[PDB]
């Protein structure tokens, strides 16, 4: 049964663009749709205008604005923003029936931040004090409404990919997914729910002890997989892989794919690769399995995708078309909304702990299926942890 239809189909959005939740700001309610990422701390908002933006927060509307007396200046690799410190009141519509004095970071300026047509105007930073900017004091948004309220302190995503292109209006029109904010629902998922422990709170990092393509063992030392870190961020698209291990992978999906022969740009994420409509041969593609980390000594499960997770639909004609959603990162693995997008996934903040179950909105065909199953005999699986 679903015990949290309030909250259930509340995300919108896609794996290009983002996956965002309705909230609102300030006294009166001022409306923006934000952006759900578990790999930030920090409640960020567009307040003032952008070319990008068709709504702002605005502080001199709100008669419970109160102004911290603080900037920040927040650079990324993927883009910056700058902005102004303070606190409001916030709600979540189809969330929990509460409201939260919370800090916000009142946009000013940004750089490549904002995406054109996305339709989210702000960023909700779910991770934890440690990565907050300027630092650990800024309560993040998650701890200020536990505190606050009696909301358990879990959550919950389930992030859709339509397993298509969605155009413009389709994507407005469309459900991405839920969050549900306190709790689980059973509904959103099959099987069972596998957790693996969250190694330490300050992004959700978690630890991989083995990866196979197809069932082969990629056969590296498994700290290869968590150098410098592992993550689950919903606020990234691909899976990223470490580039010793991103080019191992590579080299073992082109292996198992060679019936057909990609031009280099695909397997860079650059280029689309196209196929007749309906003709998409996802037979070639393998399966990948990452193993992680059990919560019993020595034990491990795995979660296993599908080229229909980490292949992205997008638009060209008639044509299927997709663009390879696996890249190279110098900052660790990467767990993104592609990957997501298979699982339901669970952040049991309260049991220090991340689980996932097979994804009732997965997309797959009729010869496979995503998969969470377990348990596997795993030796010394915190020496898969980096240190350093
Ligand atoms: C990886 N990153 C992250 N998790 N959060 C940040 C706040 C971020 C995220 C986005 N996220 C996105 O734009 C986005 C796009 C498609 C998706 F499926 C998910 N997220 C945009 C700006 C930004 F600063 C910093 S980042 O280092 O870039």
């Given at each position: 049964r679903g015990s949290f239809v309030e909250m259930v189909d509340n995300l919108r959005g896609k794996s290009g663009q983002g996956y965002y939740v309705e909230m609102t700001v300030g006294s009166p309610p001022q409306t923006l749709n934000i952006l759900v990422d578990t790999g930030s701390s920090n409640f960020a908002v567009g307040a003032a205008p952008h070319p990008f933006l068709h709504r702002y927060y605005?502080?001199?509307?709100?008669?419970?604005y109160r102004d911290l007396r603080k900037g920040v200046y927040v650079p990324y690799t993927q883009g910056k923003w700058e902005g102004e410190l303070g606190t409001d009141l916030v709600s979540i519509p189809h969330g929990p029936n509460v409201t939260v004095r919370a800090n916000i970071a009142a946009i000013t300026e940004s750089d490549k931040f904002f995406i054109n047509g996305?339709?989210?105007?702000?960023?909700?930073?779910?991770?934890?004090?440690?990565?907050?900017?300027?630092?650990?004091?800024?309560?993040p948004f998650f701890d200020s409404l536990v505190k606050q309220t009696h909301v358990p302190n879990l959550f919950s995503l389930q992030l859709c990919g339509a397993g298509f292109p969605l155009n413009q209006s389709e994507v407005l029109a469309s459900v991405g997914g839920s969050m549900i904010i306190g709790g689980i629902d059973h509904?959103?998922?099959?099987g069972s729910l596998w957790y693996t422990p969250?190694?330490?709170?300050?992004?959700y990092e978690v630890i991989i002890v083995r990866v196979e393509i197809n069932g082969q063992d990629?056969?590296?030392?498994?700290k290869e997989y968590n150098y410098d870190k592992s993550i689950v961020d919903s606020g990234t698209t691909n899976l990223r892989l470490p580039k010793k291990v991103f080019e191992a992978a590579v080299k073992s999906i082109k292996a198992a794919s060679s019936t057909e022969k990609f031009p280099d740009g695909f397997w860079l994420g650059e280029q689309l690769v196209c196929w007749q409509?309906?003709?998409?041969?996802?037979?070639?593609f393998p399966v990948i399995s990452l193993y992680l980390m059990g919560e019993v000594t020595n034990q491990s499960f795995r979660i296993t995708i599908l080229p229909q997770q980490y292949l992205r639909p997008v638009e060209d004609s008639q044509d299927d078309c997709y663009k390879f959603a696996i890249s190279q990162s110098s900052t660790g693995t990467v767990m993104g909304a592609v990957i997501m997008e298979g699982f339901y996934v669970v952040f049991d903040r309260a049991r220090k702990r991340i689980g996932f179950a097979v994804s009732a909105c997965h997309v797959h065909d009729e010869f496979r299926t995503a998969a969470v199953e377990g348990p596997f005999v795993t030796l010394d699986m915190e020496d898969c942890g980096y240190n350093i």
């Open positions: 605005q502080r001199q509307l709100s008669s419970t996305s339709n989210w105007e702000g960023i909700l930073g779910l991770a934890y004090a440690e990565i907050a900017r300027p630092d650990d004091s800024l309560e509904s959103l998922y099959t969250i190694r330490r709170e300050w992004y990629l056969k590296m030392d498994c409509a309906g003709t998409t041969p996802w037979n070639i």
